[PDB]
Symmetry: D2
Subunit: 333 residues, 4 copies
């Protein structure tokens, strides 16, 4: 699908695993810091998701994954990456720093057609698969796939709001550790709690996730907000949404509405389970949000707490490829 990836960090590298897994075609990778023999090692071994089953080798200055030759570039500034040379047209911008339309637009100088920011953007239209893809029009040059917690929250909020109306809600995500955290207490000037030892601590943290759902589902703007607790697990997180509903209902109506949407309009985005699951059961899960039927609780006919799991690395990687596929189809119709 002429995909180029900028950044070979955790998201770039798993977006590449996802593409391979989904039959997609990545033709170029850019990273200023990882050299090609290091790229091979990093792609091949993964402590959370297992060793890549397939051949990964460096051959003539290209990364070669199961025969697929991927051109590698090591440019510092996006404007200088020669995307056109590899034939990379739609590029996943995963560095975390070129996230606004102006900045992401620097990929057009090297011949990119469209840029997909895999992070919240302050101004590029944000998409969540299964919720607002019909808003995408081929004239959008730079889009964003929002965050992995927005991709978990927005499914479950779409179903709750369509059927019972969300009057207001407050969310907590119990989130696995990330790369921005510290093995032992270290400096983190912009977030003091975030520099404290990640394996030792439950750490309060912020999240713009519930805010961003107000952008993906405009009717929920200003009705949701939340926070995060980082806890010592390597991956897979859980949204805990407490919501005041507009229409009286039972918990079995909430379970029935969620099962119905996982079977139809949100098939493959929203999952449904009634088992005694814990977080390791969703390592490698491709869905954006998996509603846990037995964990939620209802205090009253309009006040309830809903629980939804997400593999914060893997489901979001798979959604980046889904948004590119949707985009391509819309741009060639």
């Amino acid at each position: 699908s002429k995909i180029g990836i900028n950044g070979f960090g955790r998201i770039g590298r798993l977006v590449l695993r996802a593409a391979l897994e989904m039959g997609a075609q990545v033709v170029a990778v850019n990273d200023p810091f990882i050299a090609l023999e290091y790229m091979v090692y990093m792609f091949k071994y993964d402590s959370t998701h297992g060793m890549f089953k397939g051949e990964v080798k460096a051959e003539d200055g290209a990364l070669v994954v199961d025969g697929k030759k991927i051109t590698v570039f090591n440019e510092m500034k996006p404007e200088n990456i020669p995307w056109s040379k590899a034939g990379a047209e739609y590029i996943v911008e995963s560095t975390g720093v070129f996230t606004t339309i102006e900045k992401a637009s620097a990929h057009f100088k090297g011949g990119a057609k469209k840029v997909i920011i895999s992070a919240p953007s302050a101004d590029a239209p944000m998409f969540v698969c299964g919720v607002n893809l019909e808003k995408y029009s081929k004239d959008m040059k730079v889009v964003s796939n929002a965050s992995c917690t927005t991709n978990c929250l927005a499914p479950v909020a779409k179903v709750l709001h369509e059927n019972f109306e969300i009057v207001e809600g407050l969310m907590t995500t119990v989130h696995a550790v990330t790369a921005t955290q510290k093995t032992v207490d270290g400096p983190s000037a912009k977030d003091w709690r975030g520099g404290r030892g990640a394996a030792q601590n439950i750490i309060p943290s912020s999240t713009g996730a519930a805010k961003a759902v107000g952008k993906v589902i405009p009717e929920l703007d200003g009705k949701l907000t939340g926070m995060a607790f980082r806890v010592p697990t390597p991956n897979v997180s859980v949204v805990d949404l407490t919501v005041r509903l507009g229409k009286e209902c039972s918990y079995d109506d909430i379970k029935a509405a969620m099962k119905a949407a996982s079977e139809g309009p949100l098939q493959g985005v929203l999952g449904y389970t009634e088992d005694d699951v814990v977080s390791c059961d969703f390592t490698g899960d491709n869905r954006s949000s998996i509603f846990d039927a037995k964990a939620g609780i209802q205090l009253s006919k309009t006040f309830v707490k809903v629980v939804s799991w997400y593999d914060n690395e893997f489901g979001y990687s798979q959604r980046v490829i889904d948004l590119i596929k949707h985009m391509q189809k819309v741009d060639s119709a």
Copy 2:
């Protein structure tokens, strides 16, 4: 004080540490399973709270801690413990098994004057220090000190209800691992999620805490309920309380009300901080509930989330001694 302790598990051992920290007097300990020389070792060394500072030895069938002799019994059945033989009068029943009035009364067959269940009871009146100690009357022979999460929830629920009226609240506690969990996946018949590998997993779980607050503050009965997530930390937990309030207010009004209560009627039970704290900052904290001012969020003038920390092992042990000291005052008044 003439305290006796039944059970030498984490609660029993740490109530012995708290007594010694607080000048209270423990004269006998019973455990059917832990022999005297193993008691010396388990009390002396503690992975979370550290080595006991002071001398701990077994001398003539007694446990001697800083010169104090503690008679040791190894009886399976309460009715068989010779409490009067050791001069033990106020028994902390900490095994978790004899929690109703009918079952805890077996201690009177051995000469006990009062029994304090250090766990929730289906029927013994439950106390939270700072919230309802004035309900205690000297004719109550069996009382309960409720649980560590109720001791964290109830102070915060009391200030919120007094000042703004709680209409409805749903609670989550992000809870450190406990002795009932498993190092690797194994059998837990009653609670299948609870048998899954504790260091690997975020584990949904139940909590009666929120329900128990309706017992302690009768006007919150049926207005509150909640759940727990067990996460891989050895100690210290956090209550995440989402509440709809009767009176409109700002978050600064909630902060002011908590600060004031921690300086006055709840001094020593409820703490207040505005620092960038994490859970390891509360290891060894003696207070029942520390309101984290900076972590809460308010969505509207009546819908807010409040975060309060607690060292689930240690604040609770100290409260058991405070409950016994209150009781001995009323009983000899």
Copy 3:
């Protein structure tokens, strides 16, 4: 291959995964404690090794795994398990308690032909695949597959001794946590260090592994001994063998000898790598021992330290099926 498994704990349950994976046929499972709906859950979800990809259901009092109907029994005493009724002939005895020939022999009363103890036996001949299988003769009714650390140590010691002669050696295994450990400091009367919180601690522990290599390779009897440090990882362990050799050599002769044996007589038992591997890279590995070329060190021409990884759960499960296959072939020739 008419296999019956006694015990549905971690080894029993992964021996069943291994059998399915290897085309073997298990016709019965016995466990007194796990009921069939709990067996389905436990087999299906695994925090370390992933969800079973396949259908697992209870159907008419049988566990049915991908069409394979497995009869379940819930007997407390091995003598009473009716193995003959399901046609279970070779039974994997994995409970950890019926480990001597007399005790394991209790399976013959229910019609078992041969018993394979998946633990060290004090008296049943111990086998390690790739090292002493030719010692097996069809008249042996009860054999043992030794332990997962013996299955890692014995390969690597066979190669070192055949080529350079082991004069003496001392081993340390840095071992992942096991089921006998405790989430927080708890009682463990027979091993006080072993009751201390597993996620918090490096814990010295014993191991009979090096002793048992003296039984599998009789020429090394009395020349090896060692110990274990339990550390907070859920699976995959590493042997660190420090050895005084009889013949002068270089580290490159040790690497060459190990590569040669992994390519021929020890193919599939002993692996060889020169990558920058860490323990998660061997989760799911089927080999008994994987020699790490870059981690070992040589001080002198006869004194060296060798490093070998093993997935202490998975490789040993796969070897139990390999020993049964070898046995069957030898018993029907």
Copy 4:
């Protein structure tokens, strides 16, 4: 004492804590990256060693700890720190970057009298308190305090060599995580294993410790070498030393020799225990090396394994202050 500290990372902060614990006087701290109000916070709160007991505030551009004013500089280059301005004379250079005599000499441009590198040095004479302090002469202007693992190895190597003669030794340290590791898999160009997820993994690593002992005890030069395994614990490490000895002996002779040295010439540096200890029992331990008597094993009268614990953050910080106090005595003698 007039101590200055360069760097406010884990070693810098804990050397400030140790000085205050020991009555020593620190008059200035430099860190280019950590601002004064963030210094207050990082010093006050500590996940492993706990909250500082005492008042810590920023007052007029100074860090005031228990009434003591500490002038703060934020200079990138040593030559630019105005050490004489604050009356700082003995500088603990703890950044890890200025470790040779040529690089550490940049501190004299600012008025320093002596520089103590709190890390190994390629050329500054290295000291281990208790082993070779008598080699210090007042003309040495730049010295090194070696590393925390050398401070654990060298006392134990000294008793073993004095009494039985070390012919050959290979060491492994099972080492807690450090600040150079990663919460999740990421880039570590120089050391690929060291970038893999620290809480997930046992990680082979290098150590110069054993080589450095040949510098500190010149007769062990070239007789020792070793490696490290980084494991998921926040602090406290253990040396596993396998040694061939010149003189035949029993393990009881090694125990007796260690016990005697800890009562006499190594009192305070080497500790001795015979309890069932685990690593959390040594958090905050001030000693450099605690011999665990019960964990070692002896194969033959000349081949034994010795286990010694150390709190890699804390014993080392205390030794830096002991080295400075020795130096100030000799310099004013």
